[PDB]
Amino acid sequence: ELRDQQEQVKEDMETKCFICGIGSDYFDTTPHGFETHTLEEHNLANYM
Amino acid sequence: VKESKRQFIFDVVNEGGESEKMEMFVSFCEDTIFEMQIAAQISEPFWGELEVQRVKFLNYLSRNFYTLRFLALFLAFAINFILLFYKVSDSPPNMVYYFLEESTGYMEPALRCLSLLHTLVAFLCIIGYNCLKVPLVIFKREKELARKLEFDGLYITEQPEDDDVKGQWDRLVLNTPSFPSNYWDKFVKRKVLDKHGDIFGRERIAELLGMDLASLEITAHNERKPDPPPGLLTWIMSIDVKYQIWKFGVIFTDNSFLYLGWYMVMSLLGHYNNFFFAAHLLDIAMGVKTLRTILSSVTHNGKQLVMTVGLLAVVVYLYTVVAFNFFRKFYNKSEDEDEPDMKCDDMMTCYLFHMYVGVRAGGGIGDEIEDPAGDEYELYRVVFDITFFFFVIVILLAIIQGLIIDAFGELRDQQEQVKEDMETKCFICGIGSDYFDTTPHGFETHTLEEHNLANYMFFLMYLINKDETEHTGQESYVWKMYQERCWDFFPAGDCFRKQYEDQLS
Amino acid sequence: MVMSLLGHYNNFFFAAHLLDIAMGVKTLRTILSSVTHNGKQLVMTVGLLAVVVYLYTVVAFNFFRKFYNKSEDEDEPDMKCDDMMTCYLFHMYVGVRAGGGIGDEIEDPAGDEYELYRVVFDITFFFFVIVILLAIIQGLIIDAFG
Amino acid sequence: NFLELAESILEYFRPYLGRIEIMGASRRIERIYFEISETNRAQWEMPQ
Ligand SMILES: CCCCCCCC/C=C\CCCCCCCC(=O)OC[C@H](COP(=O)(O)OCC[N+](C)(C)C)OC(=O)CCCCCCC/C=C\CCCCCCCC
Ligand SMILES: CCCCCCCC/C=C\CCCCCCCC(=O)OC[C@H](COP(=O)(O)OCC[N+](C)(C)C)OC(=O)CCCCCCC/C=C\CCCCCCCC
Numbered sequence: 177e178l179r180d181q182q183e184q185v186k187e188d189m190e191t192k193c194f195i196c197g198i199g200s201d202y203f204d205t206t207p208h209g210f211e212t213h214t215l216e217e218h219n220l221a222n223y224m
Numbered sequence: 225v226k227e228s229k230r231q232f233i234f235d236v237v238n239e240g241g242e243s244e245k246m247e248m249f250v251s252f253c254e255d256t257i258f259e260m261q262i263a264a265q266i267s268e269p270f271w272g273e274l275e276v277q278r279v280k281f282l283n284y285l286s287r288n289f290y291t292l293r294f295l296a297l298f299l300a301f302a303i304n305f306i307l308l309f310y311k312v313s314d315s316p317p318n319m320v321y322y323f324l325e326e327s328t329g330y331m332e333p334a335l336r337c338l339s340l341l342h343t344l345v346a347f348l349c350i351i352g353y354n355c356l357k358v359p360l361v362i363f364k365r366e367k368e369l370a371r372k373l374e375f376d377g378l379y380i381t382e383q384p385e386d387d388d389v390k391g392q393w394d395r396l397v398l399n400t401p402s403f404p405s406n407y408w409d410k411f412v413k414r415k416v417l418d419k420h421g422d423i424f425g426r427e428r429i430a431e432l433l434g435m436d437l438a439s440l441e442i443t444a445h446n447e448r449k450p451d452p453p454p455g456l457l458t459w460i461m462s463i464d465v466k467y468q469i470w471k472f473g474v475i476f477t478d479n480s481f482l483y484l485g486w487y488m489v490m491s492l493l494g495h496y497n498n499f500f501f502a503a504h505l506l507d508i509a510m511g512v513k514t515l516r517t518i519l520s521s522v523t524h525n526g527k528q529l530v531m532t533v534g535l536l537a538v539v540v541y542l543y544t545v546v547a548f549n550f551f552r553k554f555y556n557k558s559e560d561e562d563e564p565d566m567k568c569d570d571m572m573t574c575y576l577f578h579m580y581v582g583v584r585a586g587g588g589i590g591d592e593i594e595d596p597a598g599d600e601y602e603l604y605r606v607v608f609d610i611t612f613f614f615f616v617i618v619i620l621l622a623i624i625q626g627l628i629i630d631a632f633g634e635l636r637d638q639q640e641q642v643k644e645d646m647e648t649k650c651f652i653c654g655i656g657s658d659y660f661d662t663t664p665h666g667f668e669t670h671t672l673e674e675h676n677l678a679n680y681m682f683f684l685m686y687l688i689n690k691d692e693t694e695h696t697g698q699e700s701y702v703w704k705m706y707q708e709r710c711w712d713f714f715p716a717g718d719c720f721r722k723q724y725e726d727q728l729s
Numbered sequence: 730m731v732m733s734l735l736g737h738y739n740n741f742f743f744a745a746h747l748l749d750i751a752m753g754v755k756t757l758r759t760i761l762s763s764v765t766h767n768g769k770q771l772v773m774t775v776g777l778l779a780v781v782v783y784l785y786t787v788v789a790f791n792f793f794r795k796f797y798n799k800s801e802d803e804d805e806p807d808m809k810c811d812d813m814m815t816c817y818l819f820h821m822y823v824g825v826r827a828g829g830g831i832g833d834e835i836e837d838p839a840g841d842e843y844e845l846y847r848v849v850f851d852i853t854f855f856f857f858v859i860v861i862l863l864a865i866i867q868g869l870i871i872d873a874f875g
Numbered sequence: 876n877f878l879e880l881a882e883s884i885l886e887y888f889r890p891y892l893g894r895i896e897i898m899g900a901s902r903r904i905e906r907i908y909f910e911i912s913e914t915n916r917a918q919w920e921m922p923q
């Protein structure tokens with residue numbers, strides 16, 4: 177169960193944005209779009 | 225090569241990042257290309273005759289490296305089967321004499337012959353490894369060093385951490401004339417000089433990299449070609465001591481080379497005592513793939529297993545403290561009343577007794593120490609025994625079993641995840657198979673013809689092999705990006721079909 | 730059919746036909762498919778156990794021979810590591826089935842020059858053979874179910 | 876062209892230029908730009 181919970185956390189963080197909840201497929205329409213979105217557009221550290 | 229590709233895909237999917245995915249893929253392509261060159265080199269087609277014979281022999285060893293390893297395993301098994309017939313006696317066949325007890329009388333000569341063959345095969349395995357797999361190790365090391373120099377200034381703008389031994393050792397090879405011997409890029413020094421010369425000084429960079437600009441200019445201006453006749457003295461003068469020292473350090477730090485060297489050492493010791501050949505049976509773990517996977521199951525959570533054993537030791541120590549302080553009288557392991565044999569009369573002895581007997585007892589320490597019925601401390605001591613049984617025998621061993629079972633499950637889950645990813649999305653562009661399957665077998669055609677990994681690797685090989693003066697416009701574009709290590713030319717979330725969806729339809 | 734015919738030669742050959750429950754009952758067939766799913770790994774695990782026990786036998790035959798007397802009367806000793814084949818049989822047969830390993834069966838080493846070496850021998854035997862390898866077999870079956 | 880000219884200034888201030896996205900008073904998504912302090916950034920990078 178602990179292993180499954182860790183895997184679920186990792187999968188969620190890789191598949192959808194923590195802030196807006198939009199899936200990575202929409203963002204990846206541009207090269208590395210999801211990475212840029214989670215690093216510059218909806219960055220948790222930036223909100224803090 | 226198919227196994228290498230499978231391993232690379234597994235590694236990328238499991239412990240890889242999206243940002244570094246294409247960097248990892250290009251590194252894998254480079255390694256595959258170098259391995260292909262080595263395979264082509266070793267593939268089959270008085271001083272000169274001796275040299276050609278030596279080269280042919282080394283190529284044969286490199287070609288048959290794995291067959292030699294299987295032969296070594298088979299010879300070890302034969303030797304140990306013979307050793308099963310070994311016996312000890314007091315009289316020749318105080319001092320004890322070990323000898324074979326066989327009827328046919330052919331087993332002792334066969335044992336000696338097999339031991340000699342095993343030592344020879346181990347030596348040949350070492351040579352074959354050196355000729356077949358060491359080149360890739362040196363290639364990877366050299367290329368990583370070159371990239372760190374050019375794109376990180378690892379010895380110009382920054383320095384090794386001083387706890388990383390690899391950087392400190394690599395410092396030895398920077399100024400050697402033949403630093404890029406296996407890595408194909410021969411312009412690494414010039415690129416580093418042109419990149420970092422101005423900020424940190426052309427002279428300083430040239431001194432660091434062992435290059436002489438004045439000599440370069442003079443050679444460009446005029447040509448002087450003194451070439452002495454080939455000879456032993458010329459070869460000795462040619463050898464590069466510093467580079468050889470660095471290379472041998474790398475090789476002797478390589479794990480597989482160390483394992484093969486230990487194999488050879490144990491084979492040699494087998495001639496001192498035949499029973500040292502039993503150590504070579506441990507090679508089944510490395511040799512048999514099924515056993516390697518099963519043992520990877522155990523080693524997956526090896527750190528947790530070791531910490532669990534440590535926790536068991538600590539808990540047993542606490543029980544030992546309690547017993548030494550309160551339950552000393554119950555630890556008499558002697559039957560004759562005249563001579564007692566107490567175990568908790570000193571802490572060290574009682575800790576040894578606990579860890580050795582109580583842990584291995586089916587019911588715990590209570591199975592072994594005296595019965596407490598009808599004693600003032602009966603309830604305290606039954607609680608002691610029951611808690612020992614529950615915490616040590618049941619819970620902790622359950623933890624070990626659970627760690628192994630969870631390792632099995634985790635490995636299976638990782639394999640399933642790799643398979644699912646490869647079936648659901650394209651490795652290159654990351655677009656899902658649903659978009660491609662709009663046409664019959666569209667995803668299959670996309671992964672076989674449009675974004676084929678093998679095709680990308682083949683294109684990289686073709687680009688490297690083609691002369692830069694012959695490059696077309698697209699080839700020149702990709703070559704420049706590859707030289708800069710910019711992976712933007714790889715399609716990402718885009719493809720030909722998406723680009724021309726309207727017209728293609 | 731052949732076993733049924735042999736049953737007329739000896740009635741007890743009809744006991745072999747009870748093995749048919751594996752093929753006949755669907756629940757049993759599924760349960761046994763659980764075991765056979767990783768059958769190759771189970772066989773290799775048994776082989777690895779044999780090799781490890783052989784290494785322990787080699788060590789015992791070379792250093793711990795005096796502890797393998799299984800006779801009570803002092804006149805007639807019954808040694809088990811007086812020859813490698815006998816002691817390998819003794820290990821594989823008794824130590825593997827012992828709850829605590831070979832230490833449960835061989836002589837107590839207290840007060841011996843090799844006491845620490847031999848307790849390490851017993852403890853590592855118990856850990857690697859009894860705990861780990863059997864844990865591997867159990868884990869293979871459980872993983873087959875999963 | 877202006878951005879190319881200002882590359883050095885932008886590169887210098889990149890670690891301190893924080894941006895977030897909010898649902899603004901205009902009922903549209905808006906990008907907010909602000910200053911991140913060096914001390915705050917280092918503290919965020921601290922491992923705990
Ligand atoms: C990759 C893993 C790395 C770790 C591997 C560890 C390997 C274990 C062994 C040894 C350490 C190596 C160096 C030891 C050399 C000492 C020399 C020595 O030994 O000289 C004493 C006697 C020699 O014999 P002798 O006096 O009668 O003279 C015979 C001939 N004359 C009569 C000429 C006098 O020694 C003997 O007899 C030896 C009798 C045979 C001993 C058992 C052989 C080992 C088999 C199984 C153990 C497996 C352990 C695996 C490690 C765990 C890894 C998971
Ligand atoms: C993962 C968990 C790890 C488990 C760790 C070990 C668990 C071991 C458990 C249980 C044993 C229960 C019985 C303990 C004591 C019984 C003896 C007793 O009661 O005799 C009353 C004594 C009389 O003194 P005296 O004249 O005989 O000796 C005084 C000086 N001397 C000692 C050297 C001469 O009174 C006294 O000294 C009072 C002394 C203070 C008593 C401290 C005992 C604390 C030990 C365990 C606490 C919890 C145990 C129960 C729960 C199970 C664990 C979950």
Ligand SMILES: CCCCCCCC/C=C\CCCCCCCC(=O)OC[C@H](COP(=O)(O)OCC[N+](C)(C)C)OC(=O)CCCCCCC/C=C\CCCCCCCC
Nearest residue numbers: 731732735736737738739740741742743744745746747748
């Ligand atoms: C598809 C999978 C195949 C795997 C299973 C193979 C089956 C294993 C067995 C046997 C093969 C027999 C082949 C040789 C038979 C020769 C005949 C024979 O043998 O004749 C000797 C005695 C007969 O008796 P008698 O001399 O007093 O003559 C009484 C009559 N008069 C008074 C005329 C003198 O033999 C006896 O007594 C026999 C006593 C009964 C022995 C137990 C029968 C088997 C029961 C349980 C084990 C089942 C095997 C399962 C293991 C594999 C599973 C994975």
Ligand SMILES: CCCCCCCC/C=C\CCCCCCCC(=O)OC[C@H](COP(=O)(O)OCC[N+](C)(C)C)OC(=O)CCCCCCC/C=C\CCCCCCCC
Nearest residue numbers: 322781784785788791792843845846847849850853854857
């Ligand atoms: C998956 C892993 C499989 C496990 C494999 C089996 C491991 C079993 C483990 C441990 C047992 C520990 C004690 C071993 C040695 C104690 C004896 C000793 O200490 O006696 C010192 C001798 C004195 O010489 P001597 O007069 O008796 O002549 C000997 C000539 N003869 C041999 C025919 C008469 O010195 C010598 O011979 C030096 C001889 C060289 C020593 C070879 C023994 C190496 C065995 C195991 C490697 C390390 C074990 C600990 C690691 C745990 C496993 C992970």
Ligand SMILES: [Zn+2]
Nearest residue numbers: 193195196218
């Ligand atoms: Zn978002």
Ligand SMILES: [Zn+2]
Nearest residue numbers: 650652653675
């Ligand atoms: Zn694609």
